[PDB]
């Protein structure tokens, strides 16, 4: 069977529960923005792997969890059978692991005091962009959690992930020798 | 007449029909996201040309069609458009060509496979976002249905091209593996 | 302190004026998309500095002004008090400077066309992506201007910045001796 089924050609698509919705539904905005984040991370990962940083494995693990995020988002509670809710439950384990990684890098960084510019070299800049896309994904998940469609832990993970990406960007810039850019109005 | 006319400085702009709409109108959201997609493809194209891949001209032709998509979107029928299906069938022929050079997809791949493949997966995700912005305009009857079908087919092409580029470069794509640091998974 | 306060874990966040609003509120969509634009420019900047182009300094100054844009957006006029005027005020100066920079490059470039594809080399193509994200940021700020939440000059600056990014992309392509790709039917 060809990759193009054409069943999505008139603007509808399927969730994991089998429910079909218009493609501009909040579910597909959330699934799609999570995929956009994972794709941005995938490009940043290519810059890590080539430039000799060592945290590539952490970003790959995050992409795996982002697939679990996408699967949970694609399983709205309002149309989920018993057997589907195995995919709606998003366990909190990965959130705790992000906190442990944030702690690990924070020990090696200078104190964060003021706002910094998104900068610090190619990899740090890419990770700041990933961070911004992650914040956008969070904004897309918030209404689904408010409507009872999605486990609150999905949004908690994305909230914590933007802190991880911020911290990893600062870590990468420090390892490259690039000092943080601080600007204050006036 | 400089490039900055300032006619957009109060938050309104003009469609191709000359109609004034606020810049957050669904028309400009669709036009803008199609332009974002074309721009992402343009950056991927730069990486493709550096590596010497064969499909640089296909991506350039796609950018041309995306300008036609933007033109159609900027011409709502309510204030008027004809997007032919030709480009959709050409995408299908290209997908078929690359699919014939690849194994069937068995594993769930992550966005990965090299700098070029990963850039194409990002273009794929932006293309899906463009599709979501065009769907309400088609459903309202403002835009030719073929515009949404082209964007639907294009994310399939970008996915297939990413896989094809990784194969030609000899790069290992990453596959999904369950991440369960707290041993909470049941099955 | 841990950077993760978890006060955002239930879908709400803070404005600079002390409001709590849901994270999908238009204020955070605008703040977030301006941050996305600044981060995209930061990546473009790294490509520019690898070639030692002096206009890296213009891109870094723009990142600073985008921080001021974000601060203004995060300080909605509906809840601002007297001391918040330091952040709600957005003067016309940065807009006029973009126009001067646009004029500077335009006098060195071939006549303007509306039929170039996003192209012209890695730097030029990256700047065309930044331009598209800039237009998206502008779309997120215009409803806040309409609601009286944000200074009109904030949207004017983002409008002008798209034109600057377009012009700088053309200028980078020319300096590299790169032919831009042209639309064909
Ligand atoms: N534009 C989109 N944005 C976000 N999510 C999407 C979009 N299109 C589809 N999806 C989701 O991603 C899944 C796979 O996408 P796919 O393109 O195979 O589906 P489709 O567009 O419905 O069908 P087809 O492309 O074969 O016509 C869908 O089942 C749906 O859950
Ligand atoms: N922020 C935006 N997002 C998406 N599309 C836009 C945006 N602004 C304008 N457009 C569309 O793109 C076309 C060209 O944009 P341009 O920036 O020249 O228009 P403007 O902002 O209305 O005018 P000016 O920038 O000269 O004040 C416009 O005619 C309109 O159709
Ligand atoms: N997802 C988002 N999109 C856009 N802007 C955001 C988002 N989350 C927070 N903000 C804004 O950015 C500021 C800093 O974000 P931060 O992540 O520290 O806040 P939070 O998410 O509310 O708290 P925490 O992350 O500690 O639980 C916030 O005060 C808010 O103004
Ligand atoms: K498909
Ligand atoms: K968006
Ligand atoms: K203009
Ligand atoms: K969009
Ligand atoms: K935080
Ligand atoms: K690069
Ligand atoms: Mg947060
Ligand atoms: Mg223009
Ligand atoms: Mg599809
Ligand atoms: Mg404009």
Author numbering:
A (entry chain A): 56 to 241
B (entry chain E): 56 to 135, 143 to 249
C (entry chain D): 56 to 240
How does the study describe this entry?
Human ATP:cob(I)alamin adenosyltransferase (ATR) is a mitochondrial enzyme that catalyzes an adenosyl transfer to cob(I)alamin, synthesizing 5′-deoxyadenosylcobalamin (AdoCbl) or coenzyme B12. ATR is also a chaperone that escorts AdoCbl, transferring it to methylmalonyl-CoA mutase, which is important in propionate metabolism. Mutations in ATR lead to methylmalonic aciduria type B, an inborn error of B12 metabolism. Human ATR is a homotrimer with active sites that are located at the subunit interfaces.
The structure of R190C ATR·ATP represents the highest resolution structure reported so far for human ATR. An alignment of these two structures showed that the R190C mutation did not elicit a major structural change in the protein (Cα RMSD = 0.5). All six monomers in the asymmetric unit were identical and ATP could be modeled with an occupancy of one per monomer. In this structure, a complete ordering of loops, except for the first 50 residues, was observed. ATP induced ordering of residues 68 to 80 into a β-hairpin, forming the roof of the active site. An overlay of the ATP binding sites shows that many of the interactions that stabilize ATP binding are retained in the R190C ATR. Although the overall mode of ATP binding is unperturbed, the R190C mutation leads to the loss of multidentate electrostatic interactions between Arg-190 and ATP, possibly contributing to the higher KM(ATP) value and in turn, the higher KD values for cob(II)alamin (in the presence of ATP) and AdoCbl (±PPPi). Interestingly, the salt bridge between Arg-190 and the ribose oxygen is replaced by a hydrogen bond between Cys-190 and the ribose oxygen mediated via a bridging water. The salt bridges between Arg-190 and the α-phosphate oxygens are however, lost. The position of the C5′ carbon, which is attacked by cob(I)alamin, is unchanged in the crystal structure of the R190C mutant.
